[PDB]
């Protein structure tokens, strides 16, 4: 095989390198806004990219977001809520040392660490209606600070809550003040949440506190012929109708032996010479693996 991260049809991939899908979407400070790459044939991920979420925390339904973005082939990274003029009574310039970028501190580029202004954090009710006629991927976060002092210096309320509502999605959060062990130099975490939002649907955010509010959001063309390849290799320009993680394929045979996770008008996998799940989904993985494995035998008669 061609051994390079070629182009499927002249349309170029997206290279996150030391970024990750977790950080890409959150807009990791050590990462381009990637506005340069709002369209691709495939996403490229390194086996364990170091700089994903610059701030520690659990990215809820991460393994599902990866999958719904696998099909996606383009965004429209709009400022669902402008940093200025959307939050006149909130401080939007929050930053953390954990999210350093060419400097002592910063924060994600697709979220706003809302904190009080004039020592006041007013119960917010911001809302947005998807008039863009295509599904909108919204992201937000809830901050689980390591102590009551940080909670009440940022958000000025103790029994804080968050609430997110849309036509067929309602969830309410009460974040816990847990003094977790230090990771990336920080104790408290930022549990990150995502929801799709149908055309014409509207999403309502509400919070007494602890909201890591959305700045941007992806009105995204669900598309097909995409996926999160994972591999380390050069990115040189080259052409073939099918990509695999270690290289593209020109059609000498419709048979592939290269790494399963494949994208494009690709041959069939064999062994004869991309989804993921968490730990509480082993059943689901052994499904997928089994699903795969049997086909992989069937393909080599």
């Amino acid at each position, epitope marked *: 095989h061609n051994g390079k991260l070629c182009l499927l049809k002249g349309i170029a991939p997206l290279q996150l390198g030391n970024c990750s899908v977790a950080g890409w979407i959150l807009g990791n400070p050590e990462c381009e806004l990637l506005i340069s790459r709002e369209s691709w044939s495939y996403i490229v991920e390194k086996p364990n990219p170091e700089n994903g979420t610059c701030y520690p925390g659990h990215f809820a339904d991460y393994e599902e977001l990866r999958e719904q973005l696998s099909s996606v082939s383009s965004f429209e990274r709009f400022e669902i809520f402008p940093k200025e003029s959307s939050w006149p009574n909130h401080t939007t310039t929050g930053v953390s040392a954990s999210c350093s970028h060419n400097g002592e501190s910063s924060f994600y580029k697709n979220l706003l660490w809302l904190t009080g202004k004039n020592g006041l954090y007013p119960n917010l009710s911001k809302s947005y209606a998807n008039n863009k006629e295509k599904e909108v991927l919204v992201l937000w976060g809830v901050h689980h600070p390591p102590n009551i002092g940080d909670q009440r*210096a*940022l958000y000025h309320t103790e029994n804080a809550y968050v609430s997110v509502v849309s036509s067929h999605y309602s969830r309410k959060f009460t974040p816990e003040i847990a003094k977790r062990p230090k990771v990336r130099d920080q104790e408290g975490r930022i549990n990150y949440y995502w929801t799709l939002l149908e055309p014409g649907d509207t999403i309502i955010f509400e919070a007494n506190g602890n909201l890591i509010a959305p700045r941007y959001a992806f009105a995204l063309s669900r598309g097909f012929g995409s996926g999160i390849i994972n591999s380390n290799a050069p990115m040189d320009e080259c052409d073939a109708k099918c990509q695999t993680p270690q290289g593209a394929i020109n059609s000498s045979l419709p048979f592939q032996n290269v790494h399963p996770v494949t994208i494009g008008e690709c041959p069939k996998y064999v062994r004869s010479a991309g989804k993921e799940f968490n730990k509480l989904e082993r059943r689901m993985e052994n499904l997928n693996k089994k699903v795969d494995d049997g086909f992989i035998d069937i393909w080599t008669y």
Partner: antibody
Amino acid sequence: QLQQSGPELVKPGASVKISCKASGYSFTDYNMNWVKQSDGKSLEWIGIINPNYGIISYNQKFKGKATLTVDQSSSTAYMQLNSLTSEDSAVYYCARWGNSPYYYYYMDVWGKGTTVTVS
Amino acid sequence: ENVLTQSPAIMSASPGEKVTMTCRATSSVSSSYLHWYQQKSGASPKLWIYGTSNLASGVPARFSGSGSGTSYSLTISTVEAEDAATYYCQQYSGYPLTFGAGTKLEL
């Protein structure tokens, strides 16, 4: 407890830095206040530094004229006065927001205060 | 916006005597966020009430408090000459956490 820099004498316009460092508790956990007190006068809230997240906030009386920061490793907080004038000749305290449920924004321990003086 | 005035400016008193001093807020203050600090002769103040009624460590029961909204009260059942000092009221109503200029005991 809290320990503080020493008394200082300066001319106007000469910016100057005060410090105070903790002991007997985890520095990073509790928030840092700074508070002026002129001689026998009112004493007023400069602003806070949240040591953990570096989220400063100021009283708009002092905004800009004061700048606050911290160092975790030194367990220390620092307060910078810019564009000094005579009425800044006072005792500056730093303090700490003790942690408690349902009650907060109290200052349960104080440094001994530094007489920074303009003459 | 907020600012507080407290009274009396100075109290004349005798040892063994009861008192209550008042802090009034120009804007509303929750009873959970008003506090009172001891302060003597230019030394570092001390926290002696921390919940509008709750008493800190190192301060006798005599010290008491009460109130709501825009009016709050510190109270002593017995003053003693070496125990008396200036008392500063404090609150959160947003920022700034401006104090009330301390009342003073001439005792």
